[PDB]
Amino acid sequence: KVKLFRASEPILSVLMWGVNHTINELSNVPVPVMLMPDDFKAYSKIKVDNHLFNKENLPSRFKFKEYCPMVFRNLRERFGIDDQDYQNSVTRSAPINRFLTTYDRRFVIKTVSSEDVAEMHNILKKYHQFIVECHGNTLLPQFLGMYRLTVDGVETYMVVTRNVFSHRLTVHRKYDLKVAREASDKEKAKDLPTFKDNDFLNEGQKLHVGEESKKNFLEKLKRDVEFLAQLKIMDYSLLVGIHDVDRAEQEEMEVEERGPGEFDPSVDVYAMKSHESSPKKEVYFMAIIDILTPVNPEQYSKRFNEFMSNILT
Amino acid sequence: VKLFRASEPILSVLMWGVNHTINELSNVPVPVMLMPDDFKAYSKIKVDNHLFNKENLPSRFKFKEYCPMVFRNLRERFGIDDQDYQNSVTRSAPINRFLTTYDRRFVIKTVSSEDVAEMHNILKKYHQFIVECHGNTLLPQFLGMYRLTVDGVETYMVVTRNVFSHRLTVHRKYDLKVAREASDKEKAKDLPTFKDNDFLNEGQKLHVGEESKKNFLEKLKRDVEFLAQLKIMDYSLLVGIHDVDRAEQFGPGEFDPSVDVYAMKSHESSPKKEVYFMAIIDILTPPEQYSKRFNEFMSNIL
Ligand SMILES: O=c1[nH]c(=O)c2ncn([C@@H]3O[C@H](COP(=O)(O)OP(=O)(O)OP(=O)(O)O)[C@@H](O)[C@H]3O)c2[nH]1
Numbered sequence A: 001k002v003k004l005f006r007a008s009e010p011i012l013s014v015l016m017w018g019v020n021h022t023i024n025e026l027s028n029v030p031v032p033v034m035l036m037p038d039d040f041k042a043y044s045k046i047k048v049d050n051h052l053f054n055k056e057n058l059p060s061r062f063k064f065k066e067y068c069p070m071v072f073r074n075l076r077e078r079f080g081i082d083d084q085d086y087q088n089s090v091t092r093s094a095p096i097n098r099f100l101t102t103y104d105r106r107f108v109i110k111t112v113s114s115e116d117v118a119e120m121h122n123i124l125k126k127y128h129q130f131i132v133e134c135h136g137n138t139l140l141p142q143f144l145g146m147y148r149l150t151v152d153g154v155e156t157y158m159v160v161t162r163n164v165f166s167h168r169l170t171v172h173r174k175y176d177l178k179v180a181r182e183a184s185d186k187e188k189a190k191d192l193p194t195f196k197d198n199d200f201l202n203e204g205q206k207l208h209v210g211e212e213s214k215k216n217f218l219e220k221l222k223r224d225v226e227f228l229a230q231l232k233i234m235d236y237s238l239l240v241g242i243h244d245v246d247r248a249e250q251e252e253m254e255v256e257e258r259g260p261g262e263f264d265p266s267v268d269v270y271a272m273k274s275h276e277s278s279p280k281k282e283v284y285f286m287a288i289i290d291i292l293t294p295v296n297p298e299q300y301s302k303r304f305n306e307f308m309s310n311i312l313t
Numbered sequence B: 001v002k003l004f005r006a007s008e009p010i011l012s013v014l015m016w017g018v019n020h021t022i023n024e025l026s027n028v029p030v031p032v033m034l035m036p037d038d039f040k041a042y043s044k045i046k047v048d049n050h051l052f053n054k055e056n057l058p059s060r061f062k063f064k065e066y067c068p069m070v071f072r073n074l075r076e077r078f079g080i081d082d083q084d085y086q087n088s089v090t091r092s093a094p095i096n097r098f099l100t101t102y103d104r105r106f107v108i109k110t111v112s113s114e115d116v117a118e119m120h121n122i123l124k125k126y127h128q129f130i131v132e133c134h135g136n137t138l139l140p141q142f143l144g145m146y147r148l149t150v151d152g153v154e155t156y157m158v159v160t161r162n163v164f165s166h167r168l169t170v171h172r173k174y175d176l177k178v179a180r181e182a183s184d185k186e187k188a189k190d191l192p193t194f195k196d197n198d199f200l201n202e203g204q205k206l207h208v209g210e211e212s213k214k215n216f217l218e219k220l221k222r223d224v225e226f227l228a229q230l231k232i233m234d235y236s237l238l239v240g241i242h243d244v245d246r247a248e249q250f251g252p253g254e255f256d257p258s259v260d261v262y263a264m265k266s267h268e269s270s271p272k273k274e275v276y277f278m279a280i281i282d283i284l285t286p287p288e289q290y291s292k293r294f295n296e297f298m299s300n301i302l
């Protein structure tokens, strides 16, 4: 039962300790009837100064701050994420890759600017109830936690989201779609490049999901980017992952020498199966990302929606 | 849900702090042995909440535990499970500074800065005496030592196992240590602490018979020869008497010796059926002669 918080760097140990600690405190806090305005301006702050004690993995001195814990707990709940699962995913073993995932690939942890933390506070009330009015059915990021760590007198802000991609299905190709953008010769020459818009268009890539899931994708995309427009938010992207079922079947068999294309929508919430009659059997993951940025937000809404409308069939 | 609801905020912080430190310790491996730094170590946490979890706890406070590895090991050597200790402090607020936990199992005394200094001065030798006597001792059994900061004022606390039983009511109490006696004021409280000379003027005796008298004296001698060899004085032996018959006015005179470690049955040849509780207390403020005189006084009570 013993959690050592062993990690390759001390800040990950503090992250694990911090999520463990804050979730445990939260378990002794009743779940409220409703959120109250103060919950949107609240925070928890702990400062640890140990001496000759418990130094094998944690630093002796550090600080941990969690922003709006009542709100983000309610968000976890509205996204179907149990608190015990959340803490287990972060603390059973050190996150990996700044950008991290939990070891089980379920949650993504991005470090962010002080400005991003400002913008989250500014949008949080309206974001919380956009989530509530759409019952968690959205392609926007699903924010589960926001934290400030202090190790060596240095502050680091982190935002936790649900992974856009599946936690079990491999992603074989990825795009960040939003002028003109493309992938660097450096980026294009790496294990899994992030192809931008114009490499999607030069490839002639198409995603065949058939009518019903095309329609529910476009309906939630319109609702989502009208929300971000009405919040004067820009520079966001749609992140797109392609899972080639057949290639996965091969790669598994190749490690076996030394279901298939099936997934749980309650967990892989951005995932879509390819249409019955489509050249290859594929799974797609598509979500809106990078929404904490702030030329026109209405224009951004319309242009972004037209492009993403056209990547489907 | 542990709300830490308490009669004053400092008790809430005490409950929170013991809960937190015990949970952290469950993530610290039990070492093959204690090391010298464990006797100089401490845990310190500082809480600054804002608009959050303020219904029972204060928003800002500090909690420091002294030598947590050492006191965890002492808990183990006294047969006290960590989660039981935590439950006794946190399941419900301590009561009546001098406190017990809601279940009356552990005593929480507020102490001086100097007492914390002195405990540090004796701690290694005290731990070694605990290991050499296998927890079989009439000394105080220290389970934790903490410093709380609430409203910028520090409060030091030491947790001991209760001398008295946690279920059997104590009907008369004596503090045996010149000449000392109980005040007219104390003599009018509900349960006076009758001091040495009122025990003698009362003619009270504790009949435990030969078998149980002998190694009570053996352990008393071992203990205060230890405290002499540590130059400790001004300590007392505290003694409680439980009369079964008044209790009658699901069993009487019944107790678990594994829990009420200082308890003794009255001898068959004793006028009334009684339960006695007896241990050494107040051993923290810093000659040899005291050892012999104190041991002699306690010697003549069987
Ligand atoms: O609009 C907001 N409503 C809020 O309710 C709120 N709460 C925090 N913040 C943000 O926090 C950022 C830096 O971090 P932070 O201020 O959390 O550190 P701090 O003030 O506790 O300590 P320190 O930096 O002096 O050591 C600040 O620039 C603010 O953007 C908020 N912004």
Ligand SMILES: O=c1[nH]c(=O)c2ncn([C@@H]3O[C@H](COP(=O)(O)OP(=O)(O)O)[C@@H](O)[C@H]3O)c2[nH]1
Pocket: A099, A108, A110, A161, A162, A163, A164, A165, A176, A194, A239, A289, A290
């Ligand atoms: O939920 C997610 N699951 C992922 O698996 C994932 N991978 C990347 N991203 C995002 O895409 C951009 C980085 O792209 P990148 O080119 O790899 O790195 P950077 O753009 O900073 O140079 C940033 O928005 C990243 O946070 C992901 N989001």
Ligand SMILES: O=c1[nH]c(=O)c2ncn([C@@H]3O[C@H](COP(=O)(O)OP(=O)(O)O)[C@@H](O)[C@H]3O)c2[nH]1
Pocket: B098, B107, B109, B160, B161, B162, B163, B164, B193, B238, B281, B282
């Ligand atoms: O383990 C214990 N269980 C007890 O139930 C208990 N009751 C009293 N004591 C001690 O006896 C002296 C106070 O006696 P007191 O006369 O009531 O108060 P004070 O002497 O401060 O005026 C101090 O050493 C007290 O901590 C107890 N120790």
